[PDB]
């Protein structure tokens, strides 16, 4: 029974256990962790079940939750599944990890859980409650269905805007230039359905995740140590008002969570 | 002539190329400079995914043209490997990763030489040139080291 978000461990102790080889790559990983350790004290290992990008981002977003974001507060959000599925029947090709009711229940849960965290009186109580939330398997995976649906919705908006000659974030031009992702239908069948199952997110889909939940995602990419990509931000130039969450990716294949002293369980 | 290749980080790579160079050539240059395997690379220009066998001229790419690099590498997968000692190690991997790449990672993490490594999944010895997906090794599968 893998833990969703493992208990925090001292970051250099974690590094030491994980990278023991006498090789340039191990040395690079250790140097990367050293630099991360200047700003973060601990690491929580995130479960690598192909939901990791969503789990890590959402855990960080919700565990820091001081307000319910307006986009999540909006009543219209609850009308979205019926609005979209009625309009685009191909959305019924959604693979679950009826449809309108199931997605709606997921979005309702996301809103309710996030609001419950935001309404707590102390940051400590919020952190503890968020930890417990990510030990309820069923509820947790429902949250990721909500997030995947928000990614699909945002992709539809950007696609339709782009097709009308309207201004769009540039990543969306690249997202839909991919041969397996030329339209929202292909994005769903070839990329999103696989999320949490047989495949995770590409870098261009990290942008889409950031826009879906309106959080800026800062990633320490240890493999890019000593280059300008060592700290990579999704999206590159985000709205100033989006909260920032930080992840670590050793070599672009999985995302764990770095933790500040002021974020510690103890 | 000079062309630019921009990543989804706005990092810009400058390449010296010729009009008759192919997209395959360009990916090879990107591998040389960035260490990115050609099979992970997509190059996009004017909203089109460029094909390996066509030339820059074929795509009207000229001096100062900017291509965009959009990688296929996905994040979010772990597998487990049990060593000859009995220790369990956790690797961060991609379904397209080769067995050879996995053995190299075991060396980086544990110091075990790839030449000494025999990996088993579902009774099968795994061949170096094949990918995790070729063997239907999924997230949180366990491989055995002998």
Residue numbers in the entry:
A (entry chain A): 78 to 174, 183 to 351
B (entry chain B): 1 to 146
From the paper:
Having established FAM105B as a Met1-linkage-specific OTU DUB, we named the enzyme OTULIN (OTU DUB with linear linkage specificity).
The extensive S1’ Ub-binding site is likely to be important for OTULIN specificity in that it orients the proximal Ub such that only Met1 points toward the catalytic center. Importantly, OTULIN wedges these linkage points apart by two loops (aa 125–127 and 282–284) that fix Lys63 in a dedicated binding pocket. The complex structure revealed that the proximal Ub directly participates in the organization of the catalytic center. The carbonyl group of Met1 sterically interferes with the inhibited conformation of His339, pushing it into an active conformation.
